[PDB]
Amino acid sequence: MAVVTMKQLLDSGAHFGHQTRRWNPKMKRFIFTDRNGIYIIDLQQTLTYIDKAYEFVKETVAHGGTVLFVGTKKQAQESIAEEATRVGMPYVNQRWLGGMLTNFSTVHKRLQRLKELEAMEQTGGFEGRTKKEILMLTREKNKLERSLGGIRDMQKVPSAVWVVDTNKEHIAVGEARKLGIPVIAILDTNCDPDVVDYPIPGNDDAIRSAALLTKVIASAVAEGLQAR
Template structure:
C-alpha cells in the first residue's frame, strides 16, 4: 500500500515548485513543466522518492537511529515540533544555524566552550 497517494500530494500542493527565474539546473530532471511562471514538479518521481525515503527512515529508526526533524517556516514549526516529540526525536523549528552540517566540528567545539563557561559561572569562578 502506498504511503501517500498522488491525489494527496496534489491536494497538498506538492507539485508547485519555485518561480521559473529561481531554479537550480540540477533539478531539471524532476520538473514536469511550467505554468504561469511556476515550475510544476513531476509527482510520479516524487511519489517514488517519498516511498524510498519512508523505507530508509523506517529502517534507520528500527535500528535505533535518530532522525532530526527540521522545519523553520512558520507553517511548519508546530507540526515539526509535534511529530518530533511524538516520536522522541530531536527537532529544529526556529532559526537554523549556518554551518550546523558543513562545519559541525567547529560548532561542536564552540558549544563545548559555552557549556564550560556556564559551568564556571555556576561555580562562581568568574568573580
C-alpha cells in the first residue's frame, strides 16, 4: 500500500545517500547496481518493509503501544517541530543525554526539580537573594526543556520503536536495547540493516526523505490515536 503515487517516487529520487568508501552492508538484495560511485536503493525492498512496518505499528498503537519523539540531525529537527506541535507532543532536539531510559532513578528527580522550580516560579520567588542564581535557574530550566522535552506525560515504562541518528548515536540505540522493545529507523546505508528489525531504506542527509518518512509514521500513529 503506497500512499504516495508510484510515478512521483521517480520524480522524487531514491538513488542518493553515500559514496563507495562508507558502504557496510551484509545483504545482496539491497544492492542493485553500482554507478556514479553511489549505490542504488531498490524501491521494491523499500516498500515491502514500509508496509510491514506500517502494519506492525498499526497493530501496536491500536492496542495501546507508545512511541516517543527524538531527533538531533540538522535536517530533521525543524520537521518534527511542526509535526510534534500540531499533534501536541513535545520533542527533544539537541541532547539524548546518554543513559536516560535505564537511569530513570536520576532523571525522574530532575522532572521533580523542574516542577519544584516551576512551582517556585509560579509562586513568585524573585528578589529574596541575588539574581545570578535565578539567571542560572532559567539557564538550566531552558537546558532541561531543550534536552528533555517529551518526558512530561509518560509515567508508563516506555516502549521505544523510533531510532534517530543510528550511526552517530550508536550507543543511544544500545541504551534502548538493554530493555529493547523492537526498533525501526530510516536506514543509514552505512548502518547494518540486520540489527534493527525494520531497516527502512531512506536518506541519511536529505530533509525530503527524512521528513516524509516520519510524516508517514506520524499519520499512521495518529489514526490509531483517533481509533482508541
